[PDB]
């Protein structure tokens, strides 16, 4: 489904910060003693409003809030770091946690190339059957 | 690839300690009140330098250090216990997290015995076709 932003305004540009992955190729910057402080590991950037995706993203954070808050109510963990790991596990259990019924809507097996695999070897004995 | 140890020396023997799995078969030692203290749960052993694997292992710890240090830079967790669990998840997502294209290099399906499964039932109707 599409996300239709129903907010009063939308800031169409995304001025972001994140950390720099492989933050130290060669050199000594990876050694903690020599590297940057906590404050100096971030990179910045600018994203534009192509396909209105930024405005789309803003509404989505909004819709997550209720469900996220209810999740935090049910745990006794003081700091929760595992939400994405649990999502990944749920992906795996959804697809292969059970029986794969072939041609069913919940089994992701495509046999068209597998059909050509069995159909080229039909003629290895069926055509030379003199 | 092989590991070629490029260190000044190699101690070829591995004098180790670990914990003793199923540390209490029958008896009361599993009950915390009666069992050993923290200091008494370890077993020890001696490994020799067969296939130079010990010298191989020593260099490997060395090569891990940079990547490990960079990982610790990016997390806000105070104590990280989940590295192997995340490795296991990545193994699973690498193989079955996507579409399995049969005969492709990233799909681990072997059909040789499956070929004999379909080739013995070729003759159940093709040979008695009078």
């Amino acid at each position, epitope marked *: 489904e599409a996300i239709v932003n129903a907010q009063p305004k939308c800031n169409p540009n995304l001025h972001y910060w994140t950390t720099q992955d492989e*933050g130290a190729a060669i*050199g000594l910057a990876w050694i903690p003693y*020599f590297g940057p402080a906590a404050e100096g590991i971030y990179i910045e950037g600018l994203m534009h409003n192509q396909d209105g995706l930024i405005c789309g993203l803003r509404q989505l954070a909004n819709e997550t809030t209720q469900a996220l808050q209810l999740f935090l109510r049910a745990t006794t963990e003081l700091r929760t770091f595992s939400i994405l790991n649990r999502k990944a596990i749920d992906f795996l259990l959804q697809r292969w946690g059970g029986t794969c019924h072939i041609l069913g809507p919940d089994c992701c097996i495509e046999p068209h190339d597998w059909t050509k695999n069995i159909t080229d070897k039909i003629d290895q004995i069926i055509h030379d059957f003199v | *690839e092989a590991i070629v140890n490029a260190q000044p020396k190699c101690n070829p023997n591995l004098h180790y300690w670990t914990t003793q799995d199923e540390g209490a078969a029958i008896g009361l030692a599993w009950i915390p009140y009666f069992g050993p203290a923290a200091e008494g749960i370890y077993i020890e052993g001696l490994m020799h330098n067969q296939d130079g694997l010990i010298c191989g292992l020593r260099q490997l710890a060395n*090569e891990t250090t940079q990547a490990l240090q960079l990982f610790l830079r990016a997390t806000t967790e105070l104590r990280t216990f989940s590295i192997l669990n995340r490795k296991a998840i990545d193994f699973l997502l690498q193989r079955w997290g996507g579409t399995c294209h049969i005969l492709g290099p990233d799909c681990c399906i072997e059909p040789h015995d499956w070929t004999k499964n379909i080739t013995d039932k070729i003759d159940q109707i093709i040979h008695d076709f009078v």
Partner: antibody
Framework: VQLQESGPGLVKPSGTLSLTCAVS?????????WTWVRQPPGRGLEWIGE???????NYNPSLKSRVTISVDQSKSQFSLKLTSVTAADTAVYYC?????????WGQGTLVTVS | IQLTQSPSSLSASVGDRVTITCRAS??????LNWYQQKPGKAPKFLIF???NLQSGVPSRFSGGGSGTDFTLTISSLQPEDFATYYC?????????FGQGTKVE
């Protein structure tokens, strides 16, 4: 750890440039990246490619269809091979060894075309 | 990624303080290999990780900088030091060199 280059002094066009970078005083294993640099005269230097001591070589995109690097640990040397050569790579060539603490340059070989 | 090295040519005398600039399009944060090269020869090192010397390099050179701006400074110049100078980033492949900076 010392490095030394070797190769011919002449190539012909539409041919193969072959370079042997021989290491002495150690071996190609470790936390050492092994890079190749070229410099046509009176200029700056131009990065070519590199290798690590396990596999999967790395490259430069303007050369990435016609350059191969290969390591031999027994004799402990490099073969760098350029194919489909032109008249725009006559240069003094170098093999650099780059590490986390330093590195070391070689002696450089003059290679022309004709 | 490409770097910009200023200025393209210099000339000075004995007793001054000379400064050569290497400036990156991005942020790389310590990764600068400064080198020195006389004509016909092969380049020696000067300074790796933008601040620390190598063993065999005199005690009057100095480096510095991070983020996107890196400098090299030579104090109390002698008539030995006429050589082209260079800088290389190591932050990701393909690594890239500057365009030289003549000293005389």
């Amino acid at each position: 750890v010392q490095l030394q280059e070797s190769g011919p002094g002449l190539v012909k066009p539409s041919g193969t440039l072959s370079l042997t970078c021989a290491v002495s005083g150690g071996s190609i294993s470790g936390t050492n990246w092994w890079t190749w640099v070229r410099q046509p005269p009176g200029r700056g230097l131009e990065w070519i490619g590199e290798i690590y001591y396990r596999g999967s070589p790395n490259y430069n995109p303007s050369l990435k269809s016609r350059v191969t690097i290969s390591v031999d640990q027994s004799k402990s040397q490099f073969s760098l091979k350029l194919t489909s050569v032109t008249a725009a790579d006559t240069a003094v060539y170098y093999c650099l060894r780059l590490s986390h603490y330093g590195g070391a340059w070689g002696q450089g070989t003059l290679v022309t075309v004709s | 990624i490409q770097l910009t090295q200023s200025p393209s040519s210099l000339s000075a005398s004995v007793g001054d303080r000379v400064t050569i600039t290497c400036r990156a399009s991005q942020s790389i944060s310590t990764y600068l290999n400064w080198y020195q090269q006389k004509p016909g020869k092969a380049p020696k090192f000067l300074i790796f990780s933008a601040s620390n010397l190598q063993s065999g390099v005199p005690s009057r050179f100095s480096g510095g900088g991070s983020g996107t701006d890196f400098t090299l400074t030579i104090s109390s110049l002698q008539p030995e030091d006429f050589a082209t100078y260079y800088c290389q980033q190591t932050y990701n492949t393909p690594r890239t060199f500057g365009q030289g900076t003549k000293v005389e």
